[PDB]
C-alpha cells in the first residue's frame, strides 16, 4: 500500500540519523574539505538506498560498509582530474598574473603598410585588401571584382612587389 | 503630508523645499520638516549616487 512506500522513506531517514554525521567526520579527515565531505555523504547514502542488501540486515553493521564506500569514492577523486588542476589558485598569492604585450610594433607596421598601400592603383589596392585583409580565395576575389582568375593572380603578384618597392625605398627591414 | 517622502527619511533641504513648493501650490499639505545633524560618515552614504 501507500504506507509500504512511506516505510522505505522512514527507513532512509533512520540511517541518516545514525550514520550521516559520523560518516561526514570520516570523509572530512580523508579530504580536509567540508564541502567535499558533504558530497561524499550524499553519494554514499545514495548507494545505500540502491542496495537493499545493506539495509536488510540490521543485526549486521551497515556503518562499516559505508566507511568502505566513502573511502573508495575519495581515492577515485584523488586521480587524474585532481592531479593537474588542484595545485594553484589565481586568487592565491604566488601565482603570476597574465599579461599581454603592447601593440607598438604592430601599430608601426600598420602605419607603414597603410602608407605603401596609398601609393597603389585602385585595382591593386582593392585586391590585396580582399586577399590579406578579408582572407578570401583567389576565385572569390575573381567572382567579386568580375575579372579573370589569372587577373587576380597577376594583380596580387605585382602589388606585393610594388609594396616591397615602396618599403625598401623607405628602409623597412627585410 | 501630500508628499511621497517616507516619514523618518533624511532628505536634502533643497528637494524638501522644492517638493513642498509644488504641493503647497497644488493644494495638498506640504511635508513637515525638522533639521537633522548627520555625521560625515553617514552623510556620505546618503549621497544620491
Amino acid at each position: 500500500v501507500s504506507g509500504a512506500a512511506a516505510a522505505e522513506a522512514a527507513l532512509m531517514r533512520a540511517l541518516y540519523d545514525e550514520h550521516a554525521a559520523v560518516l561526514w567526520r570520516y570523509a572530512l579527515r580523508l579530504t580536509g574539505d567540508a564541502a567535499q565531505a558533504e558530497d561524499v555523504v550524499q553519494e554514499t547514502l545514495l548507494r545505500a538506498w540502491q542496495h537493499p542488501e545493506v539495509i536488510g540486515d540490521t543485526a549486521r553493521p551497515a556503518r562499516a560498509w559505508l566507511f568502505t564506500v566513502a573511502r573508495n569514492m575519495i581515492i577515485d577523486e584523488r586521480r587524474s582530474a585532481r592531479f593537474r588542476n588542484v595545485v594553484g589558485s589565481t586568487d592565491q598569492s604566488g601565482t603570476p598574473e597574465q599579461s599581454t604585450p603592447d601593440e607598438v610594433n604592430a601599430a608601426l607596421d600598420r602605419l607603414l603598410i597603410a602608407d605603401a598601400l596609398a601609393q597603389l592603383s585602385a585595382e591593386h589596392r582593392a585586391v590585396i585588401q580582399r586577399s590579406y585583409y578579408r582572407g578570401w580565395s583567389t576565385a572569390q576575389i575573381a567572382t567579386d571584382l568580375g575579372i579573370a582568375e589569372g587577373t587576380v593572380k597577376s594583380r596580387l603578384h605585382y602589388a606585393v612587389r610594388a609594396l616591397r618597392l615602396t618599403l625598401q625605398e623607405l628602409g623597412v627591414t627585410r | 503630508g501630500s508628499t511621497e517622502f517616507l516619514p523618518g527619511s533624511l532628505i536634502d533641504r533643497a528637494e524638501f523645499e522644492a517638493e513642498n513648493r509644488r504641493v503647497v501650490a497644488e493644494g495638498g499639505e506640504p511635508a513637515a520638516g525638522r533639521p537633522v545633524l548627520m555625521g560625515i560618515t553617514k552623510a556620505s552614504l546618503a549621497t544620491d549616487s
Binding site: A9, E38 | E4
Partner: protein
C-alpha cells in the same frame, strides 16, 4: 499533514519563501504600515517605519520582490575567472571556478535525486546544500563558516571582488596604474631654479 492535510498547505526551504512572496499583497501591507506610522508608539513605530522603507521600494519601482529568490544563477565570463598554467606543468585556477564547480555538482545531483525519487530526506537535505553552495558563490563567509580551500584558506567570493582596498572599486577604478611614468631616488639640486 497526516490528519488535517486537506485544510492547509505547507512547505520548506527557499521554494516556500518564493511562495510566501507570491501570496503577498505589496500595496496592502504598505498602507497597513502607514496607518501604524500616522498614529503609533515610537517603540513600535520605528520598527514599522523601517519596514516601510523596504516595502515602499517594491511598491513604487514596479519590480517584484520575487527577484530575491533565484531560479537561475549567471555564470561569469571565463576571462574573469581564468585558469593559468604553472611552469611545472601543473595548473592554477581561480577560486570562482571551484565555487561555480561545487554549485554545479550539487545542482546536477539534485536533478538525479528528483528523477530517482530519492527519499524526501535526501532531496530536502540536498537542496539545503545547494542553498549553502550558492550562498558561497555570491558572498562566501557571509553566513556561518567560510568555504575553506586547500590550507584552511577561505575562498574568495564574487562579493569579495569589490570590498576594501583590493576590491574592484578602490584598487582598479579610483586609481589605475599608468603608462608614461617612472620613479627614482631624489637628490637635492641647489643650482636648479624653482620651476
Amino acid at each position: 499533514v497526516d490528519r488535517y492535510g486537506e485544510y492547509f498547505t505547507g512547505a520548506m526551504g527557499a521554494e516556500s519563501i518564493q511562495k510566501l512572496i507570491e501570496n503577498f499583497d505589496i500595496d496592502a501591507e504598505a498602507e497597513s504600515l502607514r496607518d501604524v506610522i500616522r498614529n503609533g508608539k515610537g517603540q513600535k513605530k520605528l520598527r514599522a517605519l523601517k519596514r516601510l522603507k523596504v516595502v515602499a521600494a517594491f511598491q513604487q519601482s514596479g519590480n517584484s520582490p520575487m527577484g530575491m529568490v533565484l531560479d537561475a544563477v549567471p555564470v561569469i565570463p571565463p576571462e574573469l575567472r581564468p585558469m593559468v598554467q604553472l611552469d611545472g606543468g601543473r595548473f592554477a585556477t581561480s577560486d570562482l571556478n571551484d565555487l561555480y564547480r561545487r554549485v554545479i555538482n550539487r545542482n546536477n545531483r539534485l536533478k538525479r535525486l528528483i528523477d530517482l525519487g530519492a527519499p524526501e530526506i535526501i532531496v530536502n537535505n540536498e537542496k539545503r546544500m545547494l542553498q549553502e553552495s550558492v550562498d558561497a558563490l555570491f558572498d562566501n563567509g557571509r553566513r556561518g563558516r567560510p568555504v575553506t580551500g586547500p590550507g584552511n584558506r577561505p575562498l574568495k567570493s564574487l562579493s569579495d571582488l569589490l570590498k576594501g582596498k583590493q576590491g574592484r572599486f578602490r584598487q582598479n577604478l579610483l586609481g589605475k596604474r599608468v603608462d608614461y611614468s617612472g620613479r627614482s631616488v631624489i637628490v637635492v639640486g641647489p643650482q636648479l631654479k624653482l620651476h
